[PDB]
């Protein structure tokens, strides 16, 4: 049963480090999504 | 008879053991999943939104 778990227990921390990157992407775009929202925001406020 | 049901006992507890661990990486994998579906709503929401403004 302990091999069983140790060679079930690897192979995570490879989703683990998949998903760390993956969600800096989903943080990073969707900051620069806001911005350039944000930014159009302004461009509309000035002209009005 | 101790030890025989003993031992199946203990195989017993270490197949349900067993059972439960053998769905961390599939958990791992539908978080990763759920973070990219996440990120696709409010992507498209963020798209939409600053294409409106």
Redesign the interface.
């Given at each position: 049963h302990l091999a069983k778990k140790d060679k079930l227990d690897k192979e995570l921390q490879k989703l683990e480090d998949d998903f760390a990157k993956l969600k800096q992407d989903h943080a990073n775009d969707e900051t620069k999504l806001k911005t350039n929202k944000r930014q159009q925001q302004n461009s509309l406020a000035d002209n009005i | 008879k101790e030890a025989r049901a003993e031992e199946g006992t203990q195989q017993r507890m270490?197949e349900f053991?067993?059972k439960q661990?053998?769905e961390?990486?599939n958990n791992?994998?539908q978080?990763?999943d759920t973070?990219?579906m996440?990120?696709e709503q409010?992507?498209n929401f963020?798209?939409e939104?600053?294409d409106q403004?």
């Open positions: - | 270490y053991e067993q661990l053998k961390k990486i791992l994998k978080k990763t973070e990219n996440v990120h409010l992507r963020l798209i939104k600053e403004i």
